């Protein structure tokens, strides 16, 4: 009933691990805070938003206390576990990078369960993400 979310923080110059990103240095000691936006997603949906629009909307929301937080290790990685469901519904989370001196923070990202490899037929129990700031890139 929980999935692992593996967050890879890269200094940038599918849902599965992507070897392409190994060209970039991993950044240690970066904290990510993960917020439950499940209710907010379903509200957007009930108001007629598409799945994509609903995700885009809740991307800017960080309601309440983070359900999880993790700080990257020496290689730039951290795993957190997240419930696949919240209040009986397929869960949606907003992932926020905490500000850190000398680091360009990623834009907030949304992860909506279940996750399929981008879509394949097998649900992922391990989801890999690579938060980035495209405007900065």
Phi/psi of residue 55, each to 5°?
A: -60, -45
- CB nearer Na ion, residue 128 or residue 132: 132
Nearer to Na ion, 65 or 71 (CB): 71
132 touches Na ion by CB under 5 A: yes
Judged by CB under 5 A, which stretch of 52-60, 72-80, 86-94, 110-118 contacts Na ion? Answer: 110-118
d(CA 131, CA 49): 24
CB closer to Na ion out of 46 and 119: 119
Comparison of 47 and 51: residue with beta carbon closer to Na ion: 51
By CB under 5 A, which span of 56-64, 73-81, 88-96, 128-136 interacts with Na ion?
128-136
Q: Which residue has the tokens 């369960």?
A: 113
Please give the DSSP secondary-structure letter assigned to residue 20. G
Residue pair 53/41 in contact (Cβ under 8 Å)? The answer is: no
Q: Is the four-CA dihedral 113, 116, 118, 119 of positive or negative sign?
A: negative
Single residue of 37, 91, 109, 115 touching Na ion by CB under 5 A: 115
Interaction between residue 8 and Na ion (CB under 5 A)? no
Q: For residue 114, say if its preceding peptide bond is cis, omega within 30 degrees of 0.
A: yes
Q: Which residues bind Na ion (CB under 5 A)?
A: 12, 106, 112, 115, 132
């Amino acid at each position: 009933e929980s999935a692992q979310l593996v967050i890879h923080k890269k200094k940038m110059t599918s849902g599965k691990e992507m070897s392409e990103f190994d060209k970039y240095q991993g950044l240690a000691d970066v904290t990510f805070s993960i917020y439950n936006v499940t209710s907010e997603f379903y509200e957007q949906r009930a108001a007629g938003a598409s799945v994509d629009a609903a995700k885009q909307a809740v991307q800017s929301l960080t309601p309440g206390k983070p359900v999880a937080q993790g700080t990257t290790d020496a290689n730039g990685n951290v795993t957190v576990q997240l419930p696949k469901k919240q209040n009986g519904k397929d869960a949606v989370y907003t992932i926020k990078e905490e500000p850190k001196e000398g680091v360009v923070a990623a834009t907030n990202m949304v992860v909506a369960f279940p996750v399929y490899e981008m879509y394949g037929t097998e649900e992922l129990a391990v989801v890999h993400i690579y938060p980035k700031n495209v405007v900065a890139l």
